C-alpha cells in the first residue's frame, strides 16, 4: 500500500510532517492505513496518520471509522490505498 502520512508531533519525534507513507511489509502480509485524532474541548486535533501493520481489526474495512465509544484519542484503520485521508467515527 501507500497511506496518507501525518505527524502532529513531527518536530520532537524527528519525522516528516505531511504527505504520503509507502508501507514496508512482508510476504503477502496485509497492510492498512490508520488515522488518529483527539477531541479536546470541542476542537478536533489531528494526531497521526500513516501505515498500520497486519491487524485483525482493520480487515476488509474500506472506511477509516473509529468504534470505541468516548475515548480520549480516536483511532481507526482501513484497507486500501489512501483510505485514511478521510476519517469519521460513530
Amino acid at each position: 500500500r501507500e497511506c496518507i502520512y501525518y505527524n502532529a508531533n513531527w518536530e520532537l519525534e524527528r519525522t516528516n510532517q505531511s504527505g504520503l507513507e509507502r508501507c514496508e511489509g512482508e510476504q503477502d502480509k496485509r497492510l492498512h492505513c490508520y488515522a488518529s485524532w483527539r477531541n479536546s474541548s470541542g476542537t478536533i486535533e489531528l494526531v497521526k496518520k500513516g501505515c498500520w501493520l497486519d491487524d485483525f481489526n482493520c480487515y476488509d474495512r474500506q472506511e477509516c471509522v473509529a468504534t470505541e465509544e468516548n475515548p480520549q484519542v480516536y483511532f481507526c484503520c482501513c484497507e486500501g490505498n489512501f483510505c485514511n485521508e478521510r476519517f469519521t467515527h460513530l
Partner: antibody, heavy 115, light 111 residues
Framework: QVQLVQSGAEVKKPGASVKVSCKAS????????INWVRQAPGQGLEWMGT????????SYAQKFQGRVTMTRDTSISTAYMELSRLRSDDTAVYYC????????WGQGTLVTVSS | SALTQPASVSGSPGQSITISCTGT?????????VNWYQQHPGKAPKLMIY???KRPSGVSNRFSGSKSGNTASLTISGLQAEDEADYYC???????????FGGGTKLTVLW
C-alpha cells in the same frame, strides 16, 4: 531487521514495583501495537495487555487490572511496562511482542521478586 | 475464556504430529485469529502460524495451520530433532480483542 530489545534483569523486594523497557528497532515503532506477556518459571504464557503506541490507548488483563501500567516514549521508540505492589508469584520473565499477532518477540526480562 | 491444548505429544522423526487448541464458539468458532508460537527452552517464543493458517516468512512449510469448528490445529510435517519445543496457541491481542494463550504442549521428538 525487526527487533525488540528489553531492559536488563531486575531483582525486587515484595511490595515494591518494577518497570521494564522495550526498544523497538527495524520498523516503524508507531505502525503497530506492543503487547506484553509474562512467563512464570516452568509455566505457560500469560497475556498482560496491549498498548497502541499511536493512540496511546491501553487494554489490560483483568488479572492485572489496576496495578500494571503500560506506556511508550515514541521519540525513542520504547514501550514500558510497570508492575506495582509486587509479590512472589510475580516472579517471571516478561516479554514484549510486536503487533497483535505477536509476530516478533523481545528477548525477555527476568524479574525476581524475593525477600 | 481459556484455550485448552494437550499437555504433551511425542513423535518419531519424519512423522507428522498435530497439536490442537480448543475454545468456545465465542472465540475460536467466531474468528480466524488463532496463532501458534514455538518456544525452545529458555528462549523467547517465535511466531509459526497466525490468522489460523498463515505462515510468516522464514517459517518452514512443514508448519501448517487449520481450524474446524471450535478447535484450531497446528501441524508439523516431517518431524526434526529441532522441532522439539513448547508450542502455545494464542489469539489476536489488540483493538476489540483481548489476549489469551493455551496451556501449551510439550512436543518431544525422540531420536
Amino acid at each position: 531487521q525487526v527487533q525488540l530489545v528489553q531492559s536488563g534483569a531486575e531483582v525486587k523486594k515484595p511490595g515494591a514495583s518494577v518497570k521494564v523497557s522495550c526498544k523497538a528497532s527495524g520498523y516503524t515503532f508507531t505502525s503497530s501495537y506492543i503487547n506484553w506477556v509474562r512467563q512464570a518459571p516452568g509455566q505457560g504464557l500469560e497475556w498482560m495487555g496491549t498498548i497502541n503506541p499511536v493512540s496511546g490507548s491501553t487494554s489490560y488483563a483483568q488479572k492485572f487490572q489496576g496495578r500494571v501500567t503500560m506506556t511508550r516514549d515514541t521519540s525513542i521508540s520504547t514501550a514500558y511496562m510497570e508492575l506495582s505492589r509486587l509479590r512472589s508469584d510475580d516472579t517471571a520473565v516478561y516479554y514484549c511482542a510486536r503487533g497483535g499477532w505477536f509476530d516478533y518477540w523481545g528477548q525477555g526480562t527476568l524479574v525476581t521478586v524475593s525477600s | 475464556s481459556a484455550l485448552t491444548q494437550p499437555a504433551s505429544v511425542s513423535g518419531s522423526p519424519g512423522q507428522s504430529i498435530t497439536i490442537s487448541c480448543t475454545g468456545t464458539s465465542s472465540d475460536v468458532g467466531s474468528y480466524n485469529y488463532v496463532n501458534w508460537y514455538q518456544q525452545h527452552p529458555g528462549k523467547a517464543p517465535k511466531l509459526m502460524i497466525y490468522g489460523v493458517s498463515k505462515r510468516p516468512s522464514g517459517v518452514s512449510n512443514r508448519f501448517s495451520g487449520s481450524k474446524s469448528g471450535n478447535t484450531a490445529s497446528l501441524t508439523i510435517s516431517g518431524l526434526q530433532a529441532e522441532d522439539e519445543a513448547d508450542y502455545y496457541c494464542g489469539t489476536f491481542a489488540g483493538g476489540s480483542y483481548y489476549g489469551v494463550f493455551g496451556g501449551g504442549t510439550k512436543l518431544t521428538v525422540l531420536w
